[PDB]
Ligand binder design. Structure first.
Ligand SMILES: [Cu+2]
Ligand SMILES: [Cu+2]
Ligand SMILES: [Cu+2]
Ligand SMILES: [Cu+2]
Ligand SMILES: [Cu+2]
Ligand SMILES: [Cu+2]
Lengths: 333, 333, 333
């Protein structure tokens, strides 16, 4: 009887940050309540000022990361304010039935709905908008995110021993297909509906114009770099709702990787690079051993360094010469 | 001494259906006899009437699914009627030696051949035509299929306990590269040989014009939807002979997945989406828990909803509100 | 104290061959010393005479395969002769810190440097040049290779029993993006710097013009075919530093496969085809059972047979009719 379960309301945080949670469950099963507001808005995605009409959950690309435990109930209030123009919905890959909730959550501007589903399978999962006839347009306009369903006893390594993380970040990777004129300049549109027919033609080429982390080229660089300390255990959740990706930590590894993001499976060890298939979320666990700047990339290096799928970590602490040292610094012969 | 083994002749069925078989082997090793007839034919692949010269095993795209058990012998009579124009052959990824049989099965129109091979490795495997100098043309014209080599004791879960399926379907996914004029309209050709030079140029772009299940856009929709009941255990075999795919059941999961299709390996659990590499067959096991319409897609959603890689399941039974319910149906705020 | 460790200098060999090593370590941990010389040179990559300015480690595409054991130290002397024009460096995916050594190894023409790192994780790993601002250009001009870090007790199968190989080959797969004129003819350039701006535009299409093994179309064919004997155990290391690949042995299998190349993980069994993600090295173990010609391909068959990602094995010994036989050779009906 779900009426007699405790309820906890959770306020979401912008990526790459993640709302507060417990790894190991300190309560019985709960109804966990979330509210998300849909926002259609203009987004500048690159240093040249290219602008798209993004379709967002809660104002961000990606949508925020939701965290619950196995056999919790997720209750989502989805609001579509009347300032928007399009019909939207939400499809949870975590959920069972009705097209992941898509068939139950169709909201025109000025409408809201409340969905509940039971989080029966532990893992990280993609969620995304999927309106009939217009699925790829919404998704590739940024309307996707992820939910993490933790095991009630938290994460385990390949030997069934606890893995505890000190920090968690959510990297959502987004392929954009911005229409071009004959010469290759990006077009501008006053309203999403204006862009529709050009968007369809752009998508059909199967060639993204931009691939970005957290909604823009350079979004996770400089002062917006991810941070950690030597000796800190970091979990990086990575989702791609539409297109394959191959994450790599330049200077590091995936010590324990769930490339396809499902925790009943043992992790892969010592990964240099792993493939997250389009429409999947994955998770990688690393203990930092060296300080300095790391780049986190899609290791199609064209996609990373030309199209935008690259971020930085800034790591503090002591340099360890046992692991790596310059024996003879670069010098003329 | 193979002469003293029992023989069983099997009649193949069109995909997505699969010929009758036993999961757990009720006999000793056998010689299992199959006949396939090659058919070159015109195929309408989309709602606009685009026509290609398809090259088929037994008149279908994909070719039918063959089912045997480990250490059976497969004996294939391959017939190339004189109404065809091209040289064909067959390459079994299940088999060992002579380019999977390709070097032994080259048949001009008006010729036949009988190949035998021992099915030494359990799994689902791609088979395809592969004539020297013209391999990708035949394959991407639809000349490929799969064979399932079951373990003699059937399928097992990750703990070594039996998995029995109630229903099995075969989804063959096909990338087509239909040549275009300057404006982007599809060309027509009277004979396959006419299309050759344009096909090569079209293929080199690496950009399919169509990606379809069971040979046409919408082939697995409406009255041709796959069917199951709540509580039924369904195995979905999925092959892609040339290009990577990432299958997803909208509203469901892969409870147990062999993404690369080889049964001596434990399955992956609780998959939302899995990657089947080009040139591989995979298998996914799901128990339906909710009724209604499900979409089975390639979760590059452009490939699914724009290029054709989407099908439907129609599932009967009772709705379970514990798993999912509309708490507040869409309404004005 | 690394000063008191034994030192062994190793001379590298051209791919597809691999320098002499022990599988099971016969000594304690060592400092293993390697020297590589960077060479910018013109390369003919196809039968039509297309020429690129390749950027190489030790004069080859790919760079040579390095072999050490876990917890050895790798000491690399990297030389950039003054006949070169560009700044180069080296990034080891095997190493921890300083962008895999990239931040420590920036050498202008006329400079050298010596890097040391501890090989803490067993596996096959990509290494590549990665100069800030110009990473994909160097990598896709051929400046990448692999290092194998063997477990001290060698390789093990899924049951923890020894796997010993008789032969080892290194296949490096390279995507090239050669700029084209309007009509589709390849351009020539006198100097790498001349080609830069056209290279960037070519890369952005995400469509390779050539995908080759060992630096050229047909490089591993005919008299340069890989060789083995029936009953021989062969390890094939395969790397792709930038783009996904899906290797397949036509006529064979991967008996034991580390698709993502990391040996603390159990291998996948009985693979027909496996996905190596861009930026990864993998390894496949096969025991040859049948003689004759095998093709080793990327099983995107367009990439293999049109763009160049195909090689041959030539295998000697006795034909086994139990595994495969022609029952009725091709004949008129
Ligand atoms: Cu939407
Ligand atoms: Cu989805
Ligand atoms: Cu054929
Ligand atoms: Cu094949
Ligand atoms: Cu370089
Ligand atoms: Cu790298």
């Amino acid at each position: 009887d779900i009426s007699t379960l405790p309820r906890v309301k959770v306020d979401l945080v912008k990526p790459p940050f993640v709302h507060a949670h417990d790894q190991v469950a300190k309560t019985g099963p709960r109804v966990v309540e979330f509210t998300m507001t849909i926002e259609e808005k203009k987004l500048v995605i690159d240093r040249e000022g290219t602008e798209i009409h993004a379709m967002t959950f809660n104002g961000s690309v990606p949508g925020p990361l939701m965290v619950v435990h196995e056999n919790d109930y997720v209750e989502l209030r989805l609001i579509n304010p009347d300032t928007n123009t399009l019909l939207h919905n939400i499809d949870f890959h975590a959920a069972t039935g009705a097209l992941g909730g898509g068939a139950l959550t169709q909201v025109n501007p000025g409408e809201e709905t409340t969905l509940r589903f039971k989080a029966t399978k532990p893992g990280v999962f993609v969620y995304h908008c999927a309106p009939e006839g217009m699925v790829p347009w919404h998704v590739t306009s940024g309307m996707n995110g992820a939910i993490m369903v933790l095991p009630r006893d938290g994460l385990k390594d390949e030997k069934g021993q606890p893995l505890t993380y000190d920090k968690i970040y959510y990297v959502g990777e987004q392929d954009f297909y911005v229409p071009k004129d004959e010469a290759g300049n990006y077009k501008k549109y006053e309203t999403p509906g204006e862009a529709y027919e050009d968007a369809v033609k752009a998508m059909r080429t199967l060639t993204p114009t931009h691939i970005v982390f957290n909604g823009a080229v350079g979004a996770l660089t400089g002062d917006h770099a991810l941070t950690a300390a030597v000796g800190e255990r970091v979990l990086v959740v990575h989702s791609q709702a539409n297109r394959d990706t191959r994450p790599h930590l330049i200077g590091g590894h995936g010590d324990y990787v769930w490339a396809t993001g499902k925790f009943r499976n043992p992790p892969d060890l010592d990964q240099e690079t792993w493939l997250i298939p389009g429409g999947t979320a994955g998770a990688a666990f690393y203990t930092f051993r060296q300080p300095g700047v790391y780049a986190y990339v899609n290791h199609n290096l064209i996609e990373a360094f030309e199209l935008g799928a690259a971020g930085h970590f800034k790591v503090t602490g002591e340099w360890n010469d046992d692991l790596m040292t310059s024996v003879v610094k670069p010098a003329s012969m």
